[PDB]
Design a protein around this ligand. Structure first.
Ligand SMILES: OC[C@H]1O[C@H](O[C@H]2[C@H](O)[C@@H](O)[C@@H](O[C@H]3[C@H](O)[C@@H](O)[C@@H](O[C@H]4[C@H](O)[C@@H](O)[C@@H](O[C@H]5[C@H](O)[C@@H](O)[C@@H](O)O[C@@H]5CO)O[C@@H]4CO)O[C@@H]3CO)O[C@@H]2CO)[C@H](O)[C@@H](O)[C@@H]1O
Ligand SMILES: OC[C@H]1O[C@H](O[C@H]2[C@H](O)[C@@H](O)[C@@H](O)O[C@@H]2CO)[C@H](O)[C@@H](O)[C@@H]1O
Ligand SMILES: OC[C@H]1O[C@H](O[C@H]2[C@H](O)[C@@H](O)[C@@H](O)O[C@@H]2CO)[C@H](O)[C@@H](O)[C@@H]1O
Lengths: 1526, 67
């Protein structure tokens, strides 16, 4: 059906962690194949790789992977296949990886670097677990019970073994681990394998004899099998070692150990004649200890030649200096230090006159001096004649060269004998495990470090035997040249075994790789898996090759490994590359009760009430996505991985900690009888079995054997005594795990709580799906520490049921047989007296233990959480799509957003936002306010967060989500959305308190995603198919467009009105602003597809025309203050965009409004016949603006005084606007009027700026004139098509001016007035007074302004004209000018409003600063440095357009030879939007801020989400879509 | 660069798409309707053996005026 997992990638190709499970591995969940399907009928899993759109990897990007393309193709580690990344700047690309067989798979990405070079990322691995079945019943990986049995202790016959098989089958183990069933070596240790290719001749004879026994275990007892596989060593007496001695490290292959060989045989030769003098042979005295070192001091140490292995032969070099004194006798260089620096001269010869391999161990004379190069230096430093003190000088230098070698020798020798008298002591004197056997031929004083033998190739060799360094790094091959352990005697050896020298591949040891390959695939044909002892010491490339050979033979190979590397990261890397399915964990390692509770806590599961993952505001919601209408497209027989909700965003693939195989006792650790007591065998195995992982035990643990069995010496056989010790309990524990395994699946589906009080350990296993659970109280017996009483156990909202209880008591000691291994007689007494009290009011269960509960006892309770049934998850994950069926882009605003001021509007100031204790209120009242906080909580499972605490302390936030929608119940689809929340939150309150936070975030997250999906469906295709970043920008349209009660865009009714920003521009007269609405109209409404909503705002503002202008503040239809010289021209630009984008948009011109104002500039007749009076088509409204401006406008603001602008001066209210008809530029404004977007009227009386505009833009503003040229070009072509019926415009005196002539006047004079030439030569044509100038290559910000320097100030307003009127700009002038703005004026998120090099530059804005500063006080800095985000939009829109026209590198030959932007330009555009994507990601408000201080510094006064801040970035994405993506 | 109909004006650098019906047996015939004399050219784009995009030369043909 659907076995697909979503693996999202970052911008650098690395996989993204959806949750914080810790250091882990991309493991895919082990699930059975669909009903009646084998390996090959269909892919086992499909990994959907998600690459971000426009990311640096997408540039000529390829996905490499060693995944075979189909089941017919075998797996190769180093054969990768190509996959093409479909690059897009809007849409992410998804690439499927069909996997048909379990194994190890990796992937890396290749792309074109920014240096036009090739670059490659890391290899990222992911493991597909094998499928384990016995007959036809699937065995979940975390329900494995493994019984490890040793071969040589089960009897000499096959049927003697099948008696052991029937015993472990009664205990209900389902897997048996075998010590290797091969022919054993001399010492008969199971791990020293004589021959790898044939089994034990004592029991078996052929593969078919052992394969039938393993298959017999499968059919008879329902038990799978696996063995140990030894890669690191072989027996010291193999007949193939005589033929191939190079398979190990010898004096030929590893010459560095020659020094250690002569020291090892210096002891087999010494111990054989040791007692000849033998002052203290085998005594236990301090006098006896030092005498052995003095026999070592002179008989071996002083007889090993002072070790020339390090020191250069001093006199044998002088002998070979006069010998060749005559050859190369000159050193032309001058670098040779003088005899003054006697040490720098010593090492200078070491760098120039040395044979290869200097300074390392090798042969006896491994370190030597190049003679003809040495004497050449001696003749250049001292004399060309030898007898001139060369014998003295050459000896002085060589003695100084050997000074570090001598100190390297003294530090080695001390470690040689210090390691000696410390191990020999522990063998004899130290009473922690002694045996002072007199030095025999079998046991000399020196544990043999090298197994010496006579080879069959006519030679003698000395292969050593591996072991382990005490506390050394196991990743370092102690036999390789990098270690000095065999020399310094820092090796604990195993004489049974012998080196296995693998190299960089089969080329270094051909026969060893071929033999181990055939040895691996032999057991792979028979058994179900392998077990790797000391896997950390096996090299990666060795373990990778053979495990892949085994998986080609057995595709369902189950791999276990005793892995203790340097850290958890290295453990995960070995699991990643080798494909290890489970790691061995040992419970006997716990020294105390607290260490056991911490070990059990690690492998028990996740905390109770843990948060569940949900797609939130960080995912793409494609409008064209499949959906599960009622979470019903699932069948249990398909065994498909489930999506999170009704939306079909597949299950995410995230790193999870590697699976564990918890062993209560292995075959190497001491018995509970030894380390603790025998009674602890019961509680220890119970705590292990309760863990949600694989479990195992060694044979004899359940049978309470007395002490750890010696794997080397002992020959006794296991007892046939049945049902001894814990055998009854393990049958219960394994049978109970079989019931749980049927439904428990992923890591979020099994929860756990563990408590440790003294000698008791509490374990509470809980299934998060149904509420069923187990409770374990285990009293541990580490030592007889007296009587301890456990407090009352209390379970909230839970009912308990007694299951079973047992106590383990010792009945004397164990028998002492010589042919059978018998355990300690033990009594297994069932216990009673456990009182389970249940309060029918508080629904709380109390558990009291009986006083007869001795140490070494357990008690198991069956528990069930109240309010949870199997049908709870389905009821929560369904119905939300149907509930959002009648939602609109307006109604979603009330469900998701609504600021507290917006909510106060509908609630008259009574409601607002919920207040979280010790935290604050969410940013929005809707679901977005919760999701912005919950995303970090769900990612980290922060159950200690103040919101998590409040959710389980009461149902206040639960009812707050549902009770909010009563304010907006009458809106479209909100009633059905509320009912889904009402029914789901009601079901949640019936749950235990500690589970409410996890389920609260699940219900909110589901309804949020369904609302966000519904939004993408209602919007256009360019938005509904793009990246999260574009959709996150598109959701700002819903945040701003809402219907209100205290304001609107129409005076008659209260409909949807675009707010300027939240929350400070949303209520009353502060919501709608004409300049702000029509700058963001194209981005938030036209790009998204809100055509009908975009028309309403154009018509509503068209009624508010007066003085030929659009009001800055729109009071629906009441007093609209006309303090604007910019708004009307952005308004006419949005009209052009409506006609250009909306199909059939030319009809907008003929839409009739009702002008609520007289045609002349009179007074405010709100209640008058002049309200209706006359209508006005948009066609004549546009012409009314063009003609009123040209005919000259002059007016003083109506109702001027304290009633209006309470700071503006009397002269400021008198505004007049005029057109210079020699250039066509519209001038206007005064030094007391602030009619542009840089509106800041001073208000500081402490700085004397009350009424003084901080940024007055009098004269020709580039923004105003650029829109004028755009309007003239728009109406000219409109008249050509018969849509615009106006062609003349009268001037103030009376002459009529053709519109085309006015259009040509700007075309001939705009760039002439504003452009500042880079060359001083052309200053005579562009009207420039060079005295007041700042930078050349700049487009002017103002023309004929009051402040002459504000004319030549670098401000981001010229990009507005570059976008709307590119015809006014010559390409090379505009490209160079906008390149200056990129380097100087471009901030990380906002655009610097003023050149930093200017003297008026104050980039910090603090509205409320009381000082004597004409800038910082009372916020006069608003537009004199601070970085605004919307100007960034117009900037990059023109930065993309003019770099595409000028730079040849920004173009590439596209489809139909139409030139499209190159990937070089897309790369530069993508990098300039990274800070914007980070901002909206890590902001509680789901948008972009209005303002930013210097260099990205967050401005507290700035509105955190602004309409035109995001709308101008959506304009860029629409430009690239509508022109190229066809 | 042949306009699809007489209403569409002629542009030197505006080329129009035409799909080649691939077959291993049958050749494909694609008509180019010309309504007005002038200069017309055609080139072909296809998938390279390197799985890349490749283009042939521009091939011109002249329709003489009617006098
Ligand atoms: O009856 C309704 C209303 O009528 C009159 O309104 C006038 C104001 O009283 C008068 O001061 C003036 O308001 C203008 C201001 O002159 C102009 O310079 C501009 O001001 C800036 C602020 O300087 C700036 O700080 C910022 O204000 C933000 C602030 O940064 C933010 O941190 C937070 O505090 O929210 C503030 C906004 O609420 O930006 C504004 C511009 O958005 O624009 C102001 C608004 O036009 O002129 C008004 C119209 O005459 C009465 O005087 C008033 O009492 C009545 O309530
Ligand atoms: O919004 C409802 C309100 O409910 C809780 O307030 C409780 C709580 O016990 C304490 O806050 C106490 O001081 O006041 C109320 C007494 O029942 C939540 O704690 C609070 O956050 C929430 O807003
Ligand atoms: O002498 C030229 C002068 O230029 C720059 O000064 C600017 C000043 O920063 C602006 O505020 C402008 O309006 O007045 C000056 C015009 O150049 C340099 O900062 C300055 O060192 C230099 O002397």
């Amino acid at each position: 059906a659907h076995r697909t997992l979503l693996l999202r990638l970052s911008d650098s190709g690395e996989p993204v962690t959806s949750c914080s499970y810790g250091q882990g591995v991309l493991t895919l969940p082990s699930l059975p194949l669909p009903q009646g399907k084998k390996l090959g009928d269909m892919p086992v899993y499909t990994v959907k790789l998600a690459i971000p759109a426009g990311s640096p990897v997408t540039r000529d990007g390829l996905i490499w992977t060693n995944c075979p393309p189909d089941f017919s193709t075998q797996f190769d580690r180093e054969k990768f296949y190509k996959k093409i990344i479909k690059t897009s700047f809007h849409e992410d690309d998804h690439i499927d990886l069909d996997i048909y067989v379990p194994g190890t798979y990796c992937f890396y990405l290749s792309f074109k670097n920014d240096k036009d070079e090739l670059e490659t990322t890391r290899k990222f691995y992911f493991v597909v677990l094998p499928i384990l079945s016995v007959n036809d019943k699937f065995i979940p990986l975390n329900s494995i019970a493994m019984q490890s049995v040793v071969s040589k202790w089960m009897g000499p016959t096959i049927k003697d073994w099948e008696k052991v098989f029937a015993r472990v089958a009664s205990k209900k183990y389902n897997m048996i681990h075998f010590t290797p069933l091969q022919h054993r070596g001399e010492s008969n240790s199971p791990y020293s394998i004589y021959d790898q290719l044939e089994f034990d001749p004592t029991v078996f004879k052929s593969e078919k004899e052992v394969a039938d026994m393993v298959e017999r275990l499968r059919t008879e007892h329902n038990i799978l099998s696996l063995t140990d596989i030894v890669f690191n060593h072989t027996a010291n007496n193999s007949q193939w070692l005589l033929d191939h001695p190079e398979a190990g490290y010898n004096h030929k292959t590893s010459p560095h150990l020659i020094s250690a060989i002569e020291l090892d045989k210096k002891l087999l030769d010494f111990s054989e004649q040791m007692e000849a003098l033998g002052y203290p042979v085998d005594l236990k005295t301090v006098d006896d200890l030092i005498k052995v070192m003095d026999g070592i001091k002179e008989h071996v140490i002083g007889e090993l030649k002072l070790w020339e292995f390090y020191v250069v032969d001093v006199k044998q070099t002088v002998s070979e200096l006069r010998e060749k004194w005559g050859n190369s006798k000159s050193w032309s260089d001058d670098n040779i230090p003088s005899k003054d620096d006697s040490t720098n001269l010593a090492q200078f010869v070491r760098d120039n006159a040395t044979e290869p391999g200097f300074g390392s161990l090798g042969e006896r004379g491994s370190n030597k001096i190049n003679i003809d190069k040495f004497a050449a230096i001696l003749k250049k430093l001292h004399s060309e004649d030898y007898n001139n003190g060369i014998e003295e000088l050459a000896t002085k230098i060589l003695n100084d060269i050997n000074l570090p070698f001598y100190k390297e020798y003294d530090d080695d020798i001390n470690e040689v004998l210090e390691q000696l008298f410390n191990r020999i002591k522990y063998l004899r004197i130290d009473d922690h495990g002694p045996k002072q056997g007199p030095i025999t031929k079998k046991l000399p004083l020196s544990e043999p470090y090298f197994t010496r033998f006579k080879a069959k190739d006519g030679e003698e060799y000395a292969l050593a035997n591996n072991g382990a360094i005490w506390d050394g790094n196991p990743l370092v091959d102690f036999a390789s040249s990098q270690s000095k352990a065999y020399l310094r005697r820092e090796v604990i050896v195993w004489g049974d075994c012998v080196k296995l020298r693998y190299g960089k591949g089969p080329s270094d040891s051909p026969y060893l790789w071929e033999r181990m390959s055939k040895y691996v695939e032999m057991n792979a044909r028979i058994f179900n898996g392998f077990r790797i002892d000391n896997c950390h010491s096996t090299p990666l490339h060795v373990g990778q090759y053979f495990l892949d050979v085994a998986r080609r033979v057995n595709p369902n190979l189950y791999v276990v490994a005793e892995l203790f590397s340097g850290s958890e990261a290295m453990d995960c890397l070995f699991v990643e590359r080798l494909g290890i399915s489970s790691l061995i964990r040992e419970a006997m390692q716990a020294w105390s009760e607290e260490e056991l509770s911490r070990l059990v806590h690690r492998h028990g599961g996740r905390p109770i009430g843990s948060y569940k993952f949900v797609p939130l505001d960080d995912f793409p919601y494609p409008a064209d996505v499949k959906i599960d209408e009622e979470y019903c497209a699932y069948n249990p027989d398909d065994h498909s991985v489930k999506c999170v909700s009704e939306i079909m965003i597949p299950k995410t693939l995230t790193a999870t900690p590697p699976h564990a195989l918890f062993m209560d006792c292995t075959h190497d650790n001491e018995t509970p009888n030894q380390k603790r007591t025998v009674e602890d065998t019961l509680p220890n195995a119970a705590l292990v079995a309760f863990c949600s992982s694989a479990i195992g035990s060694v044979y004899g643990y359940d049978e309470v054997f007395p002490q750890l069995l010696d794997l080397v010496q002992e020959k006794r056989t296991y007892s046939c005594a049945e049902n001894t010790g814990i055998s009854k309990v393990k049958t219960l524990l394994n049978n109970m795990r079989e019931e749980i395994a049927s439904e428990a699946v992923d890591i979020e589906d099994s929860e756990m709580h563990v408590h440790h009080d003294g000698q008791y350990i509490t374990f509470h296993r809980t299934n998060a799906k149904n509420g069923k659970g187990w409770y374990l109280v285990a009293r541990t017996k580490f030592h007889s520490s007296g009587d301890q009483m456990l407090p009352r156990i209390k379970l909230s909202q839970t009912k308990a049921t007694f299951k079973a209880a047992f106590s383990l008591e010792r009945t004397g000691d164990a028998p002492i047989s010589d042919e059978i291994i018998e355990g300690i007689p033990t009594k297994l007494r069932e216990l009673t007296g456990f009182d389970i009290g249940f309060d029918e009011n508080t629904k709380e269960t109390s558990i009291l233990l009986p006083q007869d509960f001795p140490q070494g006892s357990i008690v198991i309770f069956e528990t069930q959480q109240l309010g949870i049934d199997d049908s709870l998850d389905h009821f929560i994950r369904s119905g939300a799509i149907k509930a959002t069926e009648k939602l609109s882009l307006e109604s979603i605003n009330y469900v998701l957003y609504r600021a507290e001021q917006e909510e106060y509007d509908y609630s008259e100031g009574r409601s607002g936002a919920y207040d979280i204790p010790d935290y604050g209120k969410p940013v929005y009242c809707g679901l977005q306010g919760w999701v912005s906080i919950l995303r970090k909580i769900i990612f980290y499972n922060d159950l200690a967060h103040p919101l998590s605490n409040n959710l389980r302390n009461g149902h206040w936030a639960v009812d707050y989500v549902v009770n909010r929608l009563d304010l907006y119940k009458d809106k479209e689809g909100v009633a059905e959305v509320q009912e889904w929340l009402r029914s789901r939150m009601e079901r949640i309150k019936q749950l235990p308190s500690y589970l409410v936070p996890s389920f609260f975030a699940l219900v909110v997250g589901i309804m949020y995603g369904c609302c966000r999906l519904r939004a993408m469906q209602l919007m256009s295709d360019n938005v509904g198919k793009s990246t999260v970043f574009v959709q996150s920008l598109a959701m700002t349209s819903i945040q701003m467009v809402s219907a209100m009660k205290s304001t609107s865009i129409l005076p008659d009714q209260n409909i949807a009105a675009m707010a300027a920003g939240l929350p400070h521009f949303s209520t009353n007269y502060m919501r709608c602003w004409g300049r702000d609405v029509f700058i963001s109209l194209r981005g938030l409404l036209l790009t998204t597809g809100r055509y009908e909503e975009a028309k309403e705002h154009i018509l509503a503002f068209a009624k508010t025309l007066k003085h030929g202008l659009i009001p800055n503040l729109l009071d629906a239809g009441r007093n609209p203050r006309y303090n604007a010289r910019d708004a009307a021209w952005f308004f006419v630009q949005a009209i052009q965009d409506y006609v250009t984008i909306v199909p059939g948009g030319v009809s907008l011109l003929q839409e009739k409004v009702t002008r609520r104002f007289p045609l002349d500039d009179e007074y405010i007749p709100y209640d008058d016949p002049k309200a209706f009076s006359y209508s006005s088509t948009i066609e004549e409204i546009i012409y009314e603006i063009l003609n009123r401006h040209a005919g000259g406008i002059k007016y003083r603001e109506a109702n001027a005084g304290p009633n209006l602008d309470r700071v503006m001066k009397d002269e400021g209210f008198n505004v007049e606007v005029n057109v210079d008809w020699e250039t066509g530029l519209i001038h206007g404004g005064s030094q007391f009027n602030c009619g542009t977007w840089m509106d800041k009227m001073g208000e500081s009386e402490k700085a004397n700026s009350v009424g003084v505009p901080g940024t007055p833009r009098d004269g020709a503003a580039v923004e105003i004139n650029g829109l004028l040229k755009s309007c003239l070009r728009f109406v000219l072509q409109l008249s050509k098509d018969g849509k615009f019926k106006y062609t003349e415009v009268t001037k103030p005196d009376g002459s009529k001016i053709s519109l085309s002539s006015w259009n040509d006047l700007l075309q001939e004079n705009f760039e002439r007035c504003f452009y500042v030439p880079k060359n001083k030569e052309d200053d005579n044509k562009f009207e420039i007074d060079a005295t007041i100038i700042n930078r050349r290559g700049i487009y002017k910000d103002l023309y004929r302004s009051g402040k002459p320097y504000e004319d030549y100030q670098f401000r981001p307003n010229f990009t507005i004209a570059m976008v709307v009127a590119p015809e006014l700009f010559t390409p090379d002038y505009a490209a160079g000018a906008i390149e200056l703005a990129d380097q100087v004026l471009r901030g990380p998120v906002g655009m610097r409003t003023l050149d930093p090099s200017d003297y008026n530059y104050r980039p910090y804005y603090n509205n409320g600063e009381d000082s004597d500063d004409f800038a910082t006080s009372k916020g006069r800095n608003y537009h004199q440095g601070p970085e605004w985000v919307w100007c960034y939009g117009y900037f990059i829109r023109a930065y993309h357009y003019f770099n595409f026209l000028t730079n040849p590198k920004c173009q590439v030959e596209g489809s139909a030879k139409k030139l499209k932007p190159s990937s070089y330009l897309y790369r530069k555009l993508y990098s300039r939007l990274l800070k914007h994507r980070e901002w909206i990601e890590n902001s509680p408000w789901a948008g972009l801020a209005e303002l930013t201080n210097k260099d990205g510094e967050v401005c507290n006064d700035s509105s955190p989400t602004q309409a035109w801040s995001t709308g101008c970035l959506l304009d860029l994405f629409y430009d690239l879509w509508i022109s190229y993506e066809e």
